[PDB]
Write an enzyme that holds these catalytic residues in place. Structure first.
Site, PDB file in Angstrom:
ATOM      1  N   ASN A 145     -60.665  29.362 -85.409  1.00 45.94           N
ATOM      2  CA  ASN A 145     -60.612  28.836 -84.064  1.00 45.94           C
ATOM      3  C   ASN A 145     -59.343  29.247 -83.319  1.00 45.94           C
ATOM      4  O   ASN A 145     -58.391  29.717 -83.940  1.00 45.94           O
ATOM      5  CB  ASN A 145     -60.659  27.319 -84.141  1.00 45.94           C
ATOM      6  CG  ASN A 145     -61.301  26.708 -82.942  1.00 45.94           C
ATOM      7  OD1 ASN A 145     -61.455  27.358 -81.906  1.00 45.94           O
ATOM      8  ND2 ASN A 145     -61.675  25.440 -83.061  1.00 45.94           N
ATOM      9  N   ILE A 146     -59.330  29.061 -81.997  1.00 46.04           N
ATOM     10  CA  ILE A 146     -58.100  29.198 -81.242  1.00 46.04           C
ATOM     11  C   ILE A 146     -57.051  28.272 -81.885  1.00 46.04           C
ATOM     12  O   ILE A 146     -57.318  27.085 -82.115  1.00 46.04           O
ATOM     13  CB  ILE A 146     -58.284  28.811 -79.758  1.00 46.04           C
ATOM     14  CG1 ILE A 146     -59.508  29.511 -79.127  1.00 46.04           C
ATOM     15  CG2 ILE A 146     -57.008  29.140 -78.981  1.00 46.04           C
ATOM     16  CD1 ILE A 146     -59.898  28.930 -77.752  1.00 46.04           C
ATOM     17  N   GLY A 157     -54.128  29.902 -86.507  1.00 46.79           N
ATOM     18  CA  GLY A 157     -53.032  30.599 -87.152  1.00 46.79           C
ATOM     19  C   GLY A 157     -53.357  32.009 -87.608  1.00 46.79           C
ATOM     20  O   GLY A 157     -52.778  32.482 -88.578  1.00 46.79           O
ATOM     21  N   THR A 168     -52.688  34.936 -86.174  1.00 46.26           N
ATOM     22  CA  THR A 168     -51.550  35.817 -85.948  1.00 46.26           C
ATOM     23  C   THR A 168     -50.433  35.516 -86.956  1.00 46.26           C
ATOM     24  O   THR A 168     -49.929  36.433 -87.614  1.00 46.26           O
ATOM     25  CB  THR A 168     -51.055  35.679 -84.483  1.00 46.26           C
ATOM     26  OG1 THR A 168     -52.117  36.068 -83.592  1.00 46.26           O
ATOM     27  CG2 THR A 168     -49.897  36.667 -84.182  1.00 46.26           C
ATOM     28  N   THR A 169     -50.085  34.237 -87.084  1.00 49.23           N
ATOM     29  CA  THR A 169     -49.151  33.751 -88.114  1.00 49.23           C
ATOM     30  C   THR A 169     -49.520  34.292 -89.503  1.00 49.23           C
ATOM     31  O   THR A 169     -48.687  34.883 -90.189  1.00 49.23           O
ATOM     32  CB  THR A 169     -49.143  32.214 -88.139  1.00 49.23           C
ATOM     33  OG1 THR A 169     -48.745  31.727 -86.852  1.00 49.23           O
ATOM     34  CG2 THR A 169     -48.066  31.675 -89.099  1.00 49.23           C
ATOM     35  N   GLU A 186     -52.994  40.111 -82.695  1.00 54.24           N
ATOM     36  CA  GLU A 186     -52.782  39.508 -81.383  1.00 54.24           C
ATOM     37  C   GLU A 186     -53.432  40.210 -80.158  1.00 54.24           C
ATOM     38  O   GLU A 186     -52.780  40.385 -79.121  1.00 54.24           O
ATOM     39  CB  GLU A 186     -51.286  39.179 -81.175  1.00 54.24           C
ATOM     40  CG  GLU A 186     -51.022  38.269 -79.973  1.00 54.24           C
ATOM     41  CD  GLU A 186     -50.803  36.800 -80.310  1.00 54.24           C
ATOM     42  OE1 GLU A 186     -49.648  36.323 -80.121  1.00 54.24           O
ATOM     43  OE2 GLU A 186     -51.789  36.106 -80.717  1.00 54.24           O
ATOM     44  N   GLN A 227     -65.349  38.618 -71.035  1.00 48.75           N
ATOM     45  CA  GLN A 227     -65.985  38.856 -72.337  1.00 48.75           C
ATOM     46  C   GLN A 227     -66.337  40.321 -72.522  1.00 48.75           C
ATOM     47  O   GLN A 227     -66.282  40.863 -73.633  1.00 48.75           O
ATOM     48  CB  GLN A 227     -67.252  37.999 -72.539  1.00 48.75           C
ATOM     49  CG  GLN A 227     -66.961  36.532 -72.806  1.00 48.75           C
ATOM     50  CD  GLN A 227     -66.008  36.279 -73.977  1.00 48.75           C
ATOM     51  OE1 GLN A 227     -65.170  35.398 -73.881  1.00 48.75           O
ATOM     52  NE2 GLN A 227     -66.153  37.031 -75.100  1.00 48.75           N
ATOM     53  N   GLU A 250     -57.026  40.977 -86.508  1.00 48.29           N
ATOM     54  CA  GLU A 250     -57.239  39.639 -85.941  1.00 48.29           C
ATOM     55  C   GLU A 250     -58.501  39.709 -85.057  1.00 48.29           C
ATOM     56  O   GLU A 250     -58.581  40.543 -84.155  1.00 48.29           O
ATOM     57  CB  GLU A 250     -56.032  39.188 -85.128  1.00 48.29           C
ATOM     58  CG  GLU A 250     -56.143  37.779 -84.584  1.00 48.29           C
ATOM     59  CD  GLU A 250     -54.849  37.248 -83.980  1.00 48.29           C
ATOM     60  OE1 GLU A 250     -53.781  37.876 -84.148  1.00 48.29           O
ATOM     61  OE2 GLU A 250     -54.898  36.193 -83.325  1.00 48.29           O
TER      62      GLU A 250
END
Ligand SMILES: Cc1cn([C@H]2C[C@H](O)[C@@H](COP(=O)(O)OP(=O)(O)OP(=O)(O)O)O2)c(=O)[nH]c1=O
Ligand SMILES: Cc1cn([C@H]2C[C@H](O)[C@@H](COP(=O)(O)OP(=O)(O)OP(=O)(O)O)O2)c(=O)[nH]c1=O
Lengths: 198, 197
Positions: free
Chosen positions: B17-18, B21, B23-24, B41, B70, B93
């Protein structure tokens, strides 16, 4: 290696303004259906997408519908450009090129496409150039005056096209001239210019 | 023969989900930059398209901007999926799949995409399946609760995301669950589920 590379015969594109007679012209090749792949009248797809008339929505509300409509036009042209055939000649009404160089550009100029919508379409066109093979050997340009094009649109009387002004056709005409005669766009296969004023 | 066929190494997609994490998580692979193709990202592209913040326009006026947004997301994912590399591993990602199965579907359900806009996107996805090779060997699903995702979004404080309700995140969560756990969508490579709470 691009998609559809080496799968396509000699390909002819029929171009010209709305109401210039591309479909009429292509209809003269009907009897040779069995030796020529003929892809005509793509507007019928745009008028009925699972029951939705995208053409109509675009004319009624361009600021909302011009982007998805041009996106769908691009897709259908790509499907036509890359459709498989055993035939030794392919002739198509319109191309991804006129969608891009005439219609999208005119919709940017008249404000139907906001900058961000125009940029999205252009980025798609650039990706398509790199990834999809578009066979184009000859373009036949059915050259008309906007006044003649306007009369043909009137005679045919597509309900979606009932509010289309002559000014719009003048704008599109100049864009077709820029592209197909003055070579202002980086599209360089051969062009045969026909007088379609009759 | 699809575009990019045979040009791609083993590929891992990071999903969730948004604010889950992704990117983390991907940042932990930084030191191996020279043996792994890392594509992280992608939202930075969507926030600046020659100076236009498409992400912002979409949140402010979804009925007009959700379709071009989109469409642009789809394009950037395709460019990432097909980008050339000599490396023997690629990690990305997001993917064209979450754009389609979670975001486009949710935008259809909430009315941001009119039927005709949704149909145009779907017809594009069907053409992409036939013409473009999308290497996907493993998906890592960073599974979170919507409340935890909400906290992370608020912490990061992207200005574009300042009006995003918890309800939206609950909707997206269920769609990620449908796709990645319950296999409700015709996407069948391997899925590793991680507890990202
Ligand atoms: C190609 C294209 C057409 N259109 C519109 C213009 C028309 O209203 C409709 C079809 O236009 P045309 O492609 O010009 O097709 P036509 O059959 O009207 O042409 P002819 O009379 O010469 O046979 O689609 C767009 O809005 N965007 C485009 O990208
Ligand atoms: C993939 C995708 C994202 N978005 C939005 C949601 C978000 O506002 C933004 C990016 O979300 P994410 O793609 O989830 O990226 P993120 O960086 O927020 O994720 P994480 O914190 O886990 O690293 O773009 C869409 O609207 N449609 C989509 O297709």
């Amino acid at each position: 290696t691009k998609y559809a590379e080496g799968t396509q015969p000699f390909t002819v594109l029929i171009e010209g303004n709305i109401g210039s007679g591309k479909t009429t012209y292509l209809n003269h090749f009907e009897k040779y259906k069995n030796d020529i792949c003929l892809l005509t009248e793509p507007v019928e797809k745009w008028r009925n997408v699972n029951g939705v008339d995208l053409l109509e929505l675009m004319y009624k509300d361009p600021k909302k519908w011009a982007m998805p409509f041009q996106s769908y036009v691009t897709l259908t042209m790509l499907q036509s450009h890359t459709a498989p055939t055993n035939k030794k000649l392919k002739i198509m009404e319109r191309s991804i090129f006129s969608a891009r160089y005439c219609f999208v550009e005119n919709m940017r100029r008249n404000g139907s496409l906001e900058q961000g919508m125009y940029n999205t379409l252009e980025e798609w066109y650039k990706f398509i150039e790199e990834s999809i093979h578009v066979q184009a050997d000859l373009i036949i340009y059915l050259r008309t005056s906007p006044e003649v094009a306007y009369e043909r649109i009137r005679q045919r009387a597509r309900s979606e096209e009932s509010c289309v002004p002559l000014k719009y056709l003048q704008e599109l005409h100049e864009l077709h001239e820029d592209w197909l005669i003055h070579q202002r766009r980086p599209q360089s296969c051969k062009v045969l210019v026909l007088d379609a004023d009759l």
